[PDB]
Amino acid sequence: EEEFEINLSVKHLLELWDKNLLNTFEIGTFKGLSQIHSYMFKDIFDFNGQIRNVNISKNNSMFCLARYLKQNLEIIDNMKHDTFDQIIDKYVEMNICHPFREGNGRSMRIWLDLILKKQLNVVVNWTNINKDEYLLAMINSLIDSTNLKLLIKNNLTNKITDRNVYIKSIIKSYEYEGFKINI
Amino acid sequence: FLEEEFEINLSVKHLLELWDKNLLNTFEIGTFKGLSQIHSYMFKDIFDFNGQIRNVNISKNNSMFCLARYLKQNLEIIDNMKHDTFDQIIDKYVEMNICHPFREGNGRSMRIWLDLILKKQLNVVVNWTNINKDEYLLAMINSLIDSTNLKLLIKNNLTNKITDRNVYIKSIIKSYEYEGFKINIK
Amino acid sequence: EEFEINLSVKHLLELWDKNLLNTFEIGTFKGLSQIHSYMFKDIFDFNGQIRNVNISKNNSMFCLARYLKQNLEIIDNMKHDTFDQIIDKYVEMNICHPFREGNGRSMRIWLDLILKKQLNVVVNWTNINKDEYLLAMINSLIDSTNLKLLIKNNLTNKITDRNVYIKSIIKSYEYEGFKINI
Amino acid sequence: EEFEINLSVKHLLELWDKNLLNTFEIGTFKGLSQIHSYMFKDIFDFNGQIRNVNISKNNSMFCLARYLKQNLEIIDNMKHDTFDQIIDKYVEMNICHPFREGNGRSMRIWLDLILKKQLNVVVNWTNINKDEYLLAMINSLIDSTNLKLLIKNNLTNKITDRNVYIKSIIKSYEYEGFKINI
Numbered sequence: 001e002e003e004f005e006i007n008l009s010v011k012h013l014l015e016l017w018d019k020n021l022l023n024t025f026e027i028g029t030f031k032g033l034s035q036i037h038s039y040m041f042k043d044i045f046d047f048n049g050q051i052r053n054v055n056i057s058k059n060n061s062m063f064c065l066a067r068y069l070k071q072n073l074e075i076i077d078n079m080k081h082d083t084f085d086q087i088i089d090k091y092v093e094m095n096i097c098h099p100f101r102e103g104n105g106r107s108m109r110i111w112l113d114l115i116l117k118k119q120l121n122v123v124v125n126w127t128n129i130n131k132d133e134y135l136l137a138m139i140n141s142l143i144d145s146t147n148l149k150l151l152i153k154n155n156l157t158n159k160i161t162d163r164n165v166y167i168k169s170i171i172k173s174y175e176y177e178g179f180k181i182n183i
Numbered sequence: 184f185l186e187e188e189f190e191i192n193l194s195v196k197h198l199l200e201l202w203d204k205n206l207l208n209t210f211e212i213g214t215f216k217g218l219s220q221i222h223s224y225m226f227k228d229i230f231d232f233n234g235q236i237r238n239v240n241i242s243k244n245n246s247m248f249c250l251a252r253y254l255k256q257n258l259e260i261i262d263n264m265k266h267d268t269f270d271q272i273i274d275k276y277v278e279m280n281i282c283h284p285f286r287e288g289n290g291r292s293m294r295i296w297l298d299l300i301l302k303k304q305l306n307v308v309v310n311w312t313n314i315n316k317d318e319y320l321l322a323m324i325n326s327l328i329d330s331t332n333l334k335l336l337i338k339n340n341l342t343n344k345i346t347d348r349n350v351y352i353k354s355i356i357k358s359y360e361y362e363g364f365k366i367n368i369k
Numbered sequence: 370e371e372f373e374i375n376l377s378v379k380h381l382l383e384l385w386d387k388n389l390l391n392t393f394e395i396g397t398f399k400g401l402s403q404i405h406s407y408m409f410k411d412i413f414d415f416n417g418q419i420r421n422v423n424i425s426k427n428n429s430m431f432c433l434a435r436y437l438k439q440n441l442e443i444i445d446n447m448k449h450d451t452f453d454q455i456i457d458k459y460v461e462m463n464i465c466h467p468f469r470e471g472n473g474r475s476m477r478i479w480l481d482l483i484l485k486k487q488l489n490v491v492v493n494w495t496n497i498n499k500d501e502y503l504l505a506m507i508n509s510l511i512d513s514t515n516l517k518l519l520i521k522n523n524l525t526n527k528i529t530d531r532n533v534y535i536k537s538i539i540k541s542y543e544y545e546g547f548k549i550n551i
Numbered sequence: 552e553e554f555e556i557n558l559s560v561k562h563l564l565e566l567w568d569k570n571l572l573n574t575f576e577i578g579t580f581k582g583l584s585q586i587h588s589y590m591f592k593d594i595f596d597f598n599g600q601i602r603n604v605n606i607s608k609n610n611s612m613f614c615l616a617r618y619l620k621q622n623l624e625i626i627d628n629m630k631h632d633t634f635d636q637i638i639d640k641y642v643e644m645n646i647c648h649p650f651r652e653g654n655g656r657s658m659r660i661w662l663d664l665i666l667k668k669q670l671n672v673v674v675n676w677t678n679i680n681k682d683e684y685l686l687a688m689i690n691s692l693i694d695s696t697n698l699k700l701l702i703k704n705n706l707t708n709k710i711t712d713r714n715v716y717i718k719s720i721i722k723s724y725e726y727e728g729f730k731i732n733i
C-alpha cells in the first residue's frame with residue numbers, strides 16, 4: 001500500500017529530527033544522501049539507500065547511465081559546495097544523476113537543506129514554493145538552472161532548528177510528488 | 184482565576200517551544216544556571232522573577248529550605264556535587280529541592296531539569312506518567328530526612344524513550360498534576 | 370539628514386578598508402566608544418561620549434545616566450569567552466544604552482568583533498529580519514534565550530569577507546529605519 | 552552446560568588478567584578468532600575456526616559457508632579509523648557470522664578492542680538493555696543508524712577499568728540468555 005510508504009517514511013523523517021540524526025549524516029556527498037534514503041525507506045523499499053543497477057527513463061530526461069553511476073556519483077561528490085551557487089549546482093547534478101530506483105526527490109530535498117544549513121545557516125522554505133513552479137524549474141534545470149536558483153534563493157529561512165518548519169517542508173515535499181499528507 | 188489559566192497554558196507553551204526549537208539541549212546540564220535557564224523560559228511573560236533567585240525566606244509548610252541570606256552561595260555548593268551516577272543525580276535533585284531557590288515554579292522546572300541530567304548521563308528520563316501524585320509528593324517530603332524511597336520510585340520508572348516528544352508531553356501533563364493543575368493536549 | 374546617514378556608512382567602510390577595526394579594544398565600553406567615536410565623528414557632538422541625560426520617552430528602561438559610568442565598568446567585568454557569555458554582555462550593554470544616539474548600529478559592529486576574536490565568526494545580519502531582531506532585543510530584557518537562538522542560527526565564518534560586512538551594514542541600518550545603498 | 556558457560560567466563564577474565572587481549576590483531580577476522588579460540592578452548596571443537604555449514608537456523612540471512620573465507624577478507628579490508636567505519640565493520644562481521652557458535656560474545660570483546668585502540672573508548676554494555684540491543688542488531692541488516700546511535704550514546708573512556716569489563720561480560724551473556732555471576 002502507498003499509505004504504508006507514506007505514513008512510515010514520514011515517521012522515519014520525524015525520527016531523524018527528534019533523535020538528532022540529521023546532523024550525523026555526511027554533508028553534500030552521495031554517502032550522506034544514501035544515509036537519508038536508507039533511513040527514510042528502511043522497512044519500505046528493499047533498495048533503501050542502494051544505488052540502482054538498471055537504467056531509468058522518465059521522459060525527455062537523461063539521467064546517469066547505470067553502468068557509470070557509482071563513478072559518476074564520485075565526480076559529483078567532489079564538486080564544491082561552499083556558495084549558494086555551488087550548492088544548487090551540486091543539487092542540479094545529483095538530481096540529473098538520479099541514483100535511486102525511487103525516492104530521489106524527497107530524499108534529495110532533505111539532503112539539500114542540510115547542505116544549506118551547514119554551509120549558509122539557512123534551509124529552503126519549501127512551504128512558499130508551489131508545486132508547479134518547482135517542478136518546472138527542476139525540468140528546466142537540465143538546460144538552465146537559473147530559474148531554480150532564483151526560486152530557491154527567494155525562499156530561504158533561517159529557522160534551521162525549528163521542528164515545525166521541518167514538518168512544513170515534509171508536507172510540501174510530498175505534495176511535489178502527488179502525496180497529500182498530514183503532520 | 185483566569186490569570187492562573189494564563190500561567191499554566193503559556194508555561195506549557197514555553198515547554199513545547201524548548202523541544203520544538205531544540206533549546207532543551209542548549210541549556211547547561213545539572214547546574215543552577217541550567218535550572219534558571221529553564222525557569223526563566225518557562226515563566227518568561229508570567230513571573231517577574233523568572234529565572235531569578237528569591238530574596239525572602241520561603242521556609243514554608245513546616246519544611247526547612249535554604250535561607251535567602253545564603254542562597255546564592257549554597258547553590259554554588261550544590262553545583263559542585265557530582266552527577267555521574269544515578270545515585271549522585273538523585274542526591275543533587277534532592278539537595279536542590281531542599282534549597283528551593285525560586286519564589287514559585289520550583290517543582291515543574293526542576294523536573295524538566297532532572298530529566299536532562301538523566302538523559303545526558305544515563306540515556307534515560309523519568310516516566311512520570313506511572314509515578315502517582317501521592318507516592319511522589321510523599322517521597323519528596325521524606326527526602327528531607329531519607330531519600331531512599333525517592334530513589335527507588337524513580338529507578339523503577341525510568342524509560343529509554345528520551346527522544347520521544349509524546350513522552351515529553353506525558354511528563355508535562357503529570358508534572359502539573361503534581362502541583363494540582365489538570366492540563367490537556369500539551 | 371541623508372548626508373549624515375551616508376557619512377557614517379562611509380566611516381564604517383573606512384574602518385574595514387583602513388584595518389582600523391582590529392585596533393579597537395575587544396568587548397569593553399572603551400572599544401565600543403572607539404567604534405562610536407569614529408562612526409559619528411562629524412555627525413554627533415557626543416561621538417564616543419557617555420550620555421548625561423536619561424533616554425527619550427516611552428516605557429523604555431535603559432540605565433540611569435547618573436550611574437551610567439559605574440554600571441559600564443561592571444558590564445566591562447563580565448566574561449566574554451563563550452557564546453553564551455558574549456550575548457549576555459551584549460544584552461546588558463544594550464540595556465545600559467550608553468550613547469544618546471547610535472547605540473544599535475555601533476553595538477552591532479562591536480559584537481561582531483567580540484565574536485570574531487573569541488569564536489572566529491560574525492553575525493550574518495543580512496539573514497536576520499528587522500521584526501524578529503527588534504523583538505528578540507526587546508524580549509532579552511525578560512529572557513535572552515530567543516536572542517541567543519536567533520544570533521547563533523545566523524553566524525557565519527566569513528569573517529574577512531568584505532561583502533558580508535557591507536550587507537551587515539545595510540541591514541543594520543534597516544533595523545533603525547534607514548534605507549541605505551552600496 | 553553451565554560449566555561451559557562459566558568456563559568461557561573464566562577464560563574472558565584470563566584474557567584481561569594475563570594481558571592477552573592486547574596481543575590480538577585489531578579489527579580483523581584473525582583477531583576475532585584469536586578471541587574466539589581462547590574463549591571457547593575446551594568448550595567447542597571449532598573454537599577459533601570458520602564454520603563449514605550454513606547456519607540454516609530459521610530464515611536468518613548470514614554469509615554462505617562456501618564463500619565465508621573470501622568475504623571475510625573483504626570485511627578485513629574495510630577501514631576502522633572512524634566510529635562510523637568501526638560499526639560498519641561490526642555490522643558486516645555480524646552478518647557474516649563466521650562461527651558455528653559464540654559469534655555474539657566474541658564479537659563484542661572484539662568490537663571493544665577496535666574502539667579502544669582507535670578512539671580510546673569501549674562500550675558500556677551494562678547500560679544497553681537486551682531488548683533494544685537485539686532489535687538494533689537485527690535491524691542493522693536493513694539500516695544500521697539506530698545501532699550506531701545506541702552504541703555511541705554508551706561509550707565510556709574507562710578503557711582500563713576491570714569492573715566495567717566485568718559488567719560488559721555480564722550483560723553480553725544476558726544478550727544471549729545466560730544469567731552469569733561475577
Ligand SMILES: Nc1ncnc2c1ncn2[C@@H]1O[C@H](COP(=O)(O)OP(N)(=O)O)[C@@H](O)[C@H]1O
Pocket residue numbers: 058059060061095100101102103104105106107138139142176177
Ligand atoms: N522529467 C524530469 N526531468 C528532470 N527531473 C525530474 C523529472 N521528473 C522528476 N524529476 C525530479 O525527480 C524527482 C522525483 O524522482 P523520484 O525518484 O520519483 O522521487 P520520489 N517521487 O520517489 O520522491 C522530482 O522531485 C524532481 O526533482
Ligand SMILES: Nc1ncnc2c1ncn2[C@@H]1O[C@H](COP(=O)(O)OP(N)(=O)O)[C@@H](O)[C@H]1O
Pocket residue numbers: 243244245246280285286287288289290291292320323324327361362
Ligand atoms: N513540604 C515539602 N517538603 C519538601 N519538598 C516539598 C514540600 N512541598 C512541596 N515540595 C516539593 O516542591 C515542589 C513545589 O514547588 P513550588 O515552587 O513550591 O510550587 P510550584 N507549584 O510553583 O512549582 C513539589 O513538586 C515538591 O517536589
Ligand SMILES: Nc1ncnc2c1ncn2[C@@H]1O[C@H](COP(=O)(O)OP(N)(=O)O)[C@@H](O)[C@H]1O
Pocket residue numbers: 429463468469470471472473474475503506507544545
Ligand atoms: N524598547 C527597547 N528595549 C531594548 N532595546 C531596544 C528597544 N528598542 C530598541 N532597542 C535596541 O536599541 C537599538 C536602537 O538604538 P539607538 O540608540 O536608536 O541607535 P541608532 N537608531 O541611532 O542606531 C536597536 O537596534 C535595538 O537593538
Ligand SMILES: Nc1ncnc2c1ncn2[C@@H]1O[C@H](COP(=O)(O)OP(N)(=O)O)[C@@H](O)[C@H]1O
Pocket residue numbers: 611645650651652653654655656657685688689692726727
Ligand atoms: N536474526 C538476527 N540477525 C542478525 N544478527 C542476529 C540475529 N539474531 C542474533 N543476532 C546477533 O548474533 C548474536 C548471537 O550469535 P550466536 O552465534 O548465537 O552467539 P552466542 N554468543 O550466543 O553463542 C546476537 O548477540 C546478535 O548480535
Ligand SMILES: [Mg+2]
Pocket residue numbers: 102103
Ligand atoms: Mg515512489
Ligand SMILES: [Mg+2]
Pocket residue numbers: 190287288
Ligand atoms: Mg503557581
Ligand SMILES: [Mg+2]
Pocket residue numbers: 470471
Ligand atoms: Mg543617526
Ligand SMILES: [Mg+2]
Pocket residue numbers: 555556559
Ligand atoms: Mg556456550
